[model samples]
Target chain A: SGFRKMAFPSGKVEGCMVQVTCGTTTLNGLWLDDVVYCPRHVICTSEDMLNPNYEDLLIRKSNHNFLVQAGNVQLRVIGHSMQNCVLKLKVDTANPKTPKYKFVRIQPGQTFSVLACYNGSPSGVYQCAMRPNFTIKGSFLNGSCGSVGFNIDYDCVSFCYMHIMELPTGVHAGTDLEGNFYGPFVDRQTAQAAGTDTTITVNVLAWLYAAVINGDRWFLNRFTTTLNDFNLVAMKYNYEPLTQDHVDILGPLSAQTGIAVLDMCASLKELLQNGMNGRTILGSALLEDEFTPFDVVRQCSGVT
Target chain B: SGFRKMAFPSGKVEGCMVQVTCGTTTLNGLWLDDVVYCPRHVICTSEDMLNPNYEDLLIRKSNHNFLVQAGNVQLRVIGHSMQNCVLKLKVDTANPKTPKYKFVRIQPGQTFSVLACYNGSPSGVYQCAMRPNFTIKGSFLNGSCGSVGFNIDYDCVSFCYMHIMELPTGVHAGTDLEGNFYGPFVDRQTAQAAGTDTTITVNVLAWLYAAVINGDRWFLNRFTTTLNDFNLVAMKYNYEPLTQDHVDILGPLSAQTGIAVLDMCASLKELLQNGMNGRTILGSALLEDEFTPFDVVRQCSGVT
Candidate 1:
């Protein structure tokens, strides 16, 4: 009652086969030594393998294991619990250029195996472990499934936190004023690059404003330079800057550079007082001793 | 040199005037006792008032103060540092129904006063204070600007932290599949209402999934019931649930409810074993003694 066979036409090696054992039932028959011996009544046609809807009812009954007749056929397994705790396998065949990998689903705690093949010869052993949730967490190997040969590529995505400001009306997140898209990136490198890339006209300061308003400390800590640049621009333009907003953005940048925005303003005022010419004032180094201002002005005027 | 006048052609109350003082210069002349004595040369034609571009150059030179003549005109003030640290005043005039209010901007640390009027009677005194950033945190009052009468209407917005998941393509945050907009709410009450309002077909569970993935503990803590409801639905449907995702979402819910998802599954299995009728099982209480499932099924079969 446990033996079953799924046959594929044209390219299938005669002795090449696989067996699945679930609880008390052995599927695709038993593997004795190096050959698969299937009961004649349990053998299925090549059409059964071609039909995607085919599932062996007994295999769904309990946890299981797999056995394979050693050969050139390479079997790949992947485990995930996305819809149901299941494993999918891709059978690599002789046609290397048009390598067709078919899929099969199996329950968690189930095990299966095939002779790991490379180019046209047996090269390694397949080794994998499945979590209770059905996620596979290992790789293929040689000299009995423990020595490295093939690696498992898990198609999983990771995430990070980002602070996005309340965008202008009709504008969406990850979009710029010029209608170009920037990011909802999975990693920090790409995000930092996009923020600092001068060739792209991205308003990095606007993003920092959003982060400050939203209290996104993680983002603020990660982009200290961007915050400094934002402070420099605000000071140079005498923008309607809020005291608290400035305090929030400048706190860490000040701690890092040992100079606050107010301190910079005071320094600028002193230079202006000692008869520093307009051109020199415009070119004076500010944050991190870098000349950042594009222009200057005196207003209400006490604090320049 | 600071004296100037902005005259209104039709609404001129001859003795009703306001004076501004910056450094040593008194604008619109001096306010001596109950009279505003303007230097004859400082008077401006009414046409100057109609143009919005009028700004006294000297007022922009330093911090200042204001003085208003005793009259039926009521002045309202608001302070903010949005663009530049400035205060804006609204002059509430005699025409109450169509009450035309004019606006004027002034520097921070500047004080202003007017004989507060109500129903054509001098009923109170206008008292206000300005922060260095120009945000007015106090209110107007009576009896020499110390006791309450009128209040400052600050048009400021506050924000909170929220965890938004990466949405599906073509879907934006604060939007649902039915094209209904729920929130980017400024408060928790509206947000909680939108999540728990069963009358609306919202995928609240999907939101929880996003929050969990994004590590939004504040959101999870705020909506414990919503998280519980989400778990109930997932258990009911036997969804292709990831073990880790379940562990993350269920950990807090279990700590609160004193029962885990596995415990519930074990209980359900036990009930099915004791000759429990289908209807009874379906109607039985689960988490927090609530009947939440719609249907049930058995497969591979050991753990129901």
Candidate 2:
């Protein structure tokens, strides 16, 4: 039987249903439309939707259209071999350092659908692909199902990565030394208005560092920046002036510009490693918490 | 008995042997050549090397001598309880990301030695502390051996962390795009002579990014620089000239002079992120790779 009525509660559209009844069986005595001549009709038959079979048993099955379903992802298992089968599953994400495994026990003659993600949403504020492949291993009855395989999508257009970076912990995206906070200051206008140049700059430098360490291009868009007036405040009052050419550091124009402002922050240490003056400031920065010596000067200036 | 014969193969000094025979038992009638002293000549007795008990057994241990030994390192099993016992070992390093583990199995009445590092040796390129603690777990015939510990020394006084960006796979330090390399270029003399302004610039930026990110003071010695002539090149061209005041961004005189030359790089990004002229140049740089359009403008002024 492949006919089931689906009722949606409040706020959900009602009457949407799925029907797959196509077996060749005689309609019982209840099929008489009141004293009229009736033609022979069939209500159901055993024609398998997927791999057909012998000895009367349906095969295992699933969908095979696009590489991923962007919105409201649902992975459904169908067929007779699914009954009483225990499936051990694992998922892969962008960060190689995380764990990715799951388990679900299923029964025969039943359709099971696993909800993957919520409406094309990512786990992190940063965009991530939700399409993940399932690795299923199990057995049903006497048929021992060994490790099974399926192709997973790694393409970013079809998939992505996610992470919130342990936000709201010790230190966060916003707020200052005195705990006065504002919006997530990722942009120059926002950071400048909030006077969080130091905070944003420190974290931004960290962001670029991870990107380069991973050799990941995903950071170039939002996290990376060409040195300029607003975003340059991290090192402001603590460093010499830099022009466009000097900022390039190396490579052609495109290459220099492609370098993240975080790279600029890193350059300060490079010079300090040898500079007699560089040593004192750099050391002080490290021994103390965040903020460079220049930051101290800025915060302390004209106050005392 | 604490007396044993250690063999010296070819090239080994013959007289360099240790002998500790002290006992008071008769040699029975088995004296060599039928010649025997009376009752006070002996060759063996039972004595433990450490934590000596009446029964007998050897010991394995070491003291906290120095930070590290700048020569070949060998950890040897020196006791009977240690013999035939399986040992599981683990090592720890400075960087939390690297792997540090070791394992060895021993047989009865055997001494096994593992050559550790060489000359206060490093586990990898990163200047990590090689000294690791060992937790020994086993069961001897008489009792269950509890958690015994040993300390391993990995030297660090002679070395330190390299490249804040996590140096690339191959050789990198003191080099240029064309492969011209030399000693540390942190000082002005070295940097000016090497003429790798741009090459050094790109990597310096990357290095400082990590120093600030990690908040490590070790970087102070080689990374942070003063706004002197040698490091002053970054602000010399292709943009508006800045005085000690502008370089300071917004602080007092001391703060202004304390500025890092790399700070110029980040400021450049800030300006570009907002400057209309900066925006135009920034766009071109992004479309391409590294060098800024301003760099192109400067270099191509009279050329094309």
Candidate 3:
């Protein structure tokens, strides 16, 4: 049986009906007024929690503890029991570079929020699980933890800030004619002149490279395929992607036209840099918005 | 003489110093806390108010009535006097098509906010005069106004949403290979499938056209200048800008390339539509973050 309708306890009106499978045993529950009253034997561990909609249902339940596996999804753990609930995040023990985290314990009625990083990288790229307006109470968790008793208001929600030095060497980093710069990493002078900190950088090349790699052939195939021909007319930078390192800088080497890569990067850079005061490259306001540029990059790179 | 430091009526500490020129007579005032106290005779009208920083200073003052001219700036009027103050928004009587507004009489201690529309047009295209974080209390005003005594905390902000039918009749409105549609105006099916109303449209053409028109020649002049050559290789769309109407659809006629125009439009459309669900074109999330695309169009079109 999927879910059976039942009256609420204390003579409360029936609300949302839910079903959960704990260790291959299915259990029925009544969700009424933000409270889920399951049979007393229901012990749904993270491993055996087989409900696809578990996150949604658990997030709505009040004053209950939940143990959830944290991987790629965002977890919102709210309204725990009197005893603290433990949350175990994943950690890649094999990779020394992987970020680490301790077991997060949520106090009663306290909200703990965390999202797993995209691709296991700690900087630049992030997986957006929460929508705008929902503030993240806890930081990002990239490592794994032991299965400790826990509670969750698991709500899934959905920027890559590229630093300059992150770009492989031999990649020419500078602003093109479109006022779009590749590798937006700026020195102290440029940042100061732009009235922003040097840490404020954008991966202009990645965005452009992603756009070209992911752009529709109908639009991208408009110009010459060769870099020499395209650069002669379009970019004028003569940045030849001779080495594999260069090709990597522009993203996937296959099916990408030189013109498309250069043009998209330049165009996006120009757009982002516009409206910002001074000789600074990227616009401060757009950067503050954060998601705008990140959204563009994610689309091009095909990141979820 | 510039601003003179003076004491508040309650002998509060002097804060920001300000000067205002009303009718060619400059008057000095002290801005303390959120109040500005000048000599009792100071009645600064908008026309002859020559201080370049008048708007900045007045916005910081509290509980005083002001009269301001409506132009290309945003006005934030906060904390008015007990007597209601009048705000005379611009009304262009000469143009019958222009939108009209009656005098706005803000209640005592009420906040009134408004920004002038860009280029006198009501739909799409706005001038950003206010920074982010400040909520807009009022709407946009276009036209002229007679002197109406008002109160203001004049601050500034800025999106352009374009409709499909608004394009010239000859303009072809559809999505390109980049998944970027030209005119984002969608029919019921597309809108519903995309989980949005038909009114949610973006001027993909305007942003694209503006990018090319405003693109740096070094980057743009990469391929052949002729549209036919560029289109043969880049954008497969065989549409020709034969008539003046066609030329106008792509924006400024003098120096734009057919390839640049088509490529930019297609690329932007592709990026925006990438993360959205369903078979529908354009992403609802990006559209909700309205400023992203609007910022691009404003930059290319050179709107302040």
Candidate 4:
């Protein structure tokens, strides 16, 4: 029951992977060790589930025997729970300190996957939780991960960003101009198969790009003030902090730009951490930021 | 007749100035010394017109007195010709070698100004011309320049960019975040008092920004491949040449992006140095290259 068919179309494998199939799509990644958890509910090796720090971090409450898998260049968490449990995953990598637990729902006997690159994350763990009375029941709609493997899809890469893994040199496929391994026009029939996660991610990126471009004091200050050191936007590439004097000018700027900034950021943070609450939040962020001419083109077009 | 009213809203004047009142607008600038060249048709301090090499450059033909003025921190050629003459100006500056004279037509009895910063220019003169048989008689367009005087507008600064001069010091007004010297919106009423020059400038900047962002081979090639040493886009900040292997990829990229790049460059060069066209081609060369997205907004917006 654990062994699902997998394909490495690029003819390269960095480590090990476990696969799961449901409808028209399939997802796979490096397994921790050959071990089965939750019976046929999940297929992951023992080493992948080897995290003993079961206290405050990766395992807050576990009705299910939680298993995890690690890709040398990517990190993937697939949900195949028998119980319709709402889940929250809080990952503490070497980067952002005290990161919030971003969540989504896994329906009973339904299958889904969440993936991100592990390049900047050396040693880390995801504190897993199944909210007992969690009201939001939103599903993990769509996206992908590893720059190689099935994750090379844009719906995947656009949100989590490219995975620049150094270990398996040629094992990974080369990317396009945006450092995406898959071609921009790849899996067109599949990309038309879309979801909310990517929309949320792009809106956030496009919003931040405009903020920086416009130098909108309102938006700039919310980011600069809230994130004194680490930043979601700045971390994609190395970034220097905005000057203090620059921050001071925010107090003097018009409230409209500032209000717009606050609305966008709040919506992003909400959707990232909350369940169904995120849908409205993401839609609002898009509405608020997309009124700008360029964002309208990007938000409204499927050219990418 | 030799003097006219001027405005120093900042209560500062560093040197002598010559002013002309034609229609609704009054234009004035620091003059070298006083002499009447056009019999009240032009004003000069004799030395301003005392170039002995006037035969080869300033007076290739003489239906016009063709007087011009040179500012130490800036170079300005105010076309005071009563005869409708198409002109070309060539100045060899520190940045570019063997630049040529390009021309634009000046209307008879029409008073206008063409200014450029001489901050980078060492020693040079425009070998003026009448475009003898050339048919494209164009008019002066929208843009401004500042050396030690007050043409340093931030809207002008953020985009094709500003010429920072040390002499004017605080005498020159500072722009706001939108690369403007006044309030963000105060300049709005004026910015909307827009021109085709700025539109062309923004689109050029936006096009270049996308090319850099996309790293389109054709666009990238037109800058790195064609010009071995000289560059209109590479001189903005200091630029290192693209690698050889990188240049090798241009042959393979789609020509659409390249065609677009060539079109934009040709159009820019046309307007920049056309006979009596624009004296600030070199300055624009610096700006055309500084157009990352941040620079686009700053260079193109009114927030400053």
Candidate 5:
């Protein structure tokens, strides 16, 4: 049977009505379709609409068109050995406030790759409608009955690469410090914006000892100016500015924007090993419960 | 029995590696050091590390001072807790020729949070040396020992908040066909860039009706010139043109930028729900991704 109504109550449409009937050998005794449906509808006939004929669910015994339904979702089961379990993987948005159930499923043996499909009508706010987010999650169930479970729609194929950093709770040297400032990277909890400039004069000064120690080039190009420029543009548009609150020590950004600043001390293996090397882009954002403080400077900047 | 000598068999770290030893005990023979340790620990850990007494890894019991005795890393099982499991994070960078064991951690449980502490000795290449990149995954272990597992970190966090728009694949629409395309948010996989000021023109533009029908505004100010400007500045420094080719639509900055776009939708929902009351500070990059993609994009830009 295809997706249809079950014995479940409140499955009623606002103004529609439904009646329950059982299976019988009689030809027209309260038949579901009320017609002498033959051939495909022989042997296993359901006089009962509520508890469908065990055959109704069986691919060999049930009507191909008889709608089968479950979980407000259709449970179309096919008994054919070669079958596609078309499923509508849904995270019921009835409660739009929070994620109700994180339902995920992959092929029986596939763990890393997920199938991609439309995530239609998930219960939630409209924000996600544009890019449409979906996840891959499902299982293969071989039931006692020949009925096959169809999970046709709702799958967001994603590749699980790896996460090298544990953000939020983890702190940088500057985080523990009371008075330190950094750019681009700001607090998560507070919107206290900061400049993403890697070559601020003050920063160069602070790291002067290290640069001199390692014969490094802390102030090679007008790198300072370039960073300042990024900040300048940010200021022009009233963009989120970098704030200097109290942090342990400003964690480093790559000197060239893509390289790791601390890469110098490969011994700083903890970070060097797991840190984003050449591949760390905007990773800071993929976290929660971050520290975003109020931008006092901006509030007092005399600008809107 | 702290983390000792972890090595990524891969020539140069970055993918995934299992624990040389799924330590039976948390404390005693097994101990907590920054990275997985055990010099001969390279690529393997004998099962004997954990003693029953030291099973539940405690902080004070951990020898915080991690050593670089071996060429790679020795990881510890401490810091964060996910339901009833450990968040084992480790990395080994003995060979810059090919840093080994990029990352390691136990799978987490549903609704569990993470707290991690990292050592900064070899602190470069990682996005969060000072600040850890933190995220909770949506997965749980079975009722057995090895049964414990973790879902992808953000799979637990972001997807839940995703605005699941049921869309026909290859669909991108805006309200006005003539609206300017102000994004670099195009997929490199195909050929579309969300570059700024580009006309949002399409002959078959009625698709814009989809977003509107769903009640969403894609042109909110989150897509800002200021953002583009800084992005360009960074790209230029890296000698990367702020062109679409350099950026992956679903890559780092773009993904977050996109989310910032959606957050506007979430914010819009807030305004509507709040009777359009309360001032919402829009256009702030202070917004963060619960499980940011920054790190991934960084690598794409060639940072190592």
Candidate 6:
């Protein structure tokens, strides 16, 4: 049995990644998120396809460490041949110690939603689990396969978003002719590697290369909104497989672009002192009234 | 004075690149298409502010054994400076052996034109020297104070921009954004180090970040554009920036967003050669023709 090593090659983002190995082949695999793989192919026999396993698999829990706008925080699980795999998801309060936990399980390979999940006020830690509900005494059941795991990889910003770090995400006015992406930041520092990248996408290769034009610390960083900003399907240098040509032109734009104004008067010491705001935004954007400005807005606008 | 280097750092770009890098910290800057540097701070006793010691450092008579594009071309230059540095450009097209070069100098951060010199032709190898016609002996220069041999950190496109390369440069895109400036590629790659930057009016960092989200290849990867494709910017992870918000929108993008598509193509070629065009795009994208649905729509359309 080959040891399974999961990693995200790029992340101008967090949580987005793919698989590296699968059986005798090792090409660009699929996004491998919270998952479980059987050491060997577990075929579902006539009686076993209905029941799954996982009688004693430890389910680890962690908070996304983000307090998204309270809307709906849900999880969707997908497996390759779950046949009788049962999965469950639980959302606990943010309090680390003495916290609460709920659970929801989906059969393998099937997508199931977990209710009782709120993003805004009830923001907190989250986790999930899987169980093979049945076993099989089989005869060459063929579909030689193990369990595949897909987490709640998809999320929704249902309400107006507040700037997390005042860091400009890919969301912006428009794409350049060469399809270069952009955003905002405080100083050339944020524009620099800003921080270590866990994922390969949205990476900051250099301070000057990170975009943030003026290199000011008081500016907000924008985020990418268009699928064009995330055309993971299009081949880099090729730009196909993912047709993100349908640009939803919001308004007229200027060749120039920038970030949001950071909140002044806040002590740098006390800034990260409270809440989930620290990890959420670049140091400059947190303010008394935290609201994400028009990131990716057109420079053509006389408006700020 | 710092030892002159051949090229500057790089920023990732999406389209093909035609880059030229002058040694680091040297005045060998671009006031639009004319590459130049100051020679011992010439004075401005003359009424003309465009007075400075201009010198043309390196000239590539050969593609240096590089993969080059040959044909008619276009060269649009952008000048930098607080005042206008009207340059006098001359393409030495008279000699086939020495080829032709554009000769001109800028004032303390100024600009000029070269349409008449190239006769509108901007391709091929050439050499140039500063007429230094604007200098007055010794005066305040634009960015630096050196005549040392350095690089011409720039971008030159050939064959309808099918082939492009950067002159070993990556950082802030431009020298001065608030003032009159010119250039075609994204202007936020060659950024200045701390204490080196002065402008703060337009938030160059933020705007540049915005530029990057749309596309950022202007800072990284020196490659060629194959007509139907203009991969000038090559930083988008899978033609996109990966973000938690992105995974939230759709799902985890890939196992590896940072893998260079070219790297994948190597294996892709092997798969196809071994008869796997049925599933992989590598084989199909090649056999694909003009009428082929999506061979390189990205090439026709500048953006992905």
Tens-digit per-residue lDDT, A1-304, candidate 6 = 0000011111111121111222232111111123322211122223432332323221121223111111233323232321122112122322112112112223211121101001111100111111111111111001111111122221221110011111232211111111111122211113322232121111111111112332323323232223443333223322212121112121111123322111111211123233234232221222211011111121111110
Ranked by lDDT, the better of candidates 1 and 5 is 1
lDDT digits (tens) for residues A66-105 of candidate 5: 3332224432323212111111111112222121112232
Top candidate (lDDT): 3
lDDT of 2 by residue, B1-304 (tens): 0000110010001011111112321111101111111111112232222123322221222111111111222222121111111111111212121122222222111111111111121100001111111111011110001111111112111111111000122112211111122233221112122222222233223223322332322223333334454235445432223345433322321132353544534443443334322122211211111222222221122110
lDDT of 4: 0.23
DockQ of predictions, in order shown = 0.01, 0.01, 0.01, 0.01, 0.01, 0.01
In Å, residue A72's CA in model 2 sits off its true spot by: 20
Candidate 1 TM-score, true structure as reference:
0.15
Error of 5 at A161 (Å): 28
* Tens-digit lDDT track of model 2 for A1-304: 0001110010000000011111332111100011100011111123331222322332222222111211233222121111111111111212121122222221111111110111121100010111111111010110001111111111111101111111211122211111112233221111222222222233223323322333333223333334564335435434333444333422232242455443544453443233222122211212111222222221122110
Candidate 6 per-residue lDDT, tens place, B157-195, comes to: 111001111122221112121212223322122332322
TM-score of 5: 0.19
Q: Each candidate's chain A: what TM-score? A: 0.17, 0.17, 0.22, 0.20, 0.17, 0.17
RMSD of model 6 against the true structure: 25.9
List the candidates' TM-scores in order.
Answer: 0.15, 0.17, 0.19, 0.21, 0.19, 0.18
DockQ of 3: 0.01
Task: Tell me what TM-score chain A of model 2 achieves.
Answer: 0.17
What ranges in model 5 sit over 4 Å off? Answer: A1-55, A59-304, B1-219, B222-286, B294-304
Error of 5 at B252 (Å): 8.5
Backbone clashes per model, in order? 7, 67, 42, 40, 131, 169
Worst 10 residues of 3 chain B by lDDT: B1-10
lDDT of 5 at A162: 11
Q: What CAPRI grade goes to candidate 6?
A: incorrect
Q: Alpha-carbon error at A47 in model 5, in Å?
A: 22
Interface RMSD of 3: 26.7
Most accurate candidate by TM-score: 4
lDDT of each: 0.23, 0.20, 0.24, 0.23, 0.20, 0.19
Candidate 6 deviant stretches above 4 angstroms: A1-80, A83-269, A272-283, A287-304, B1-304
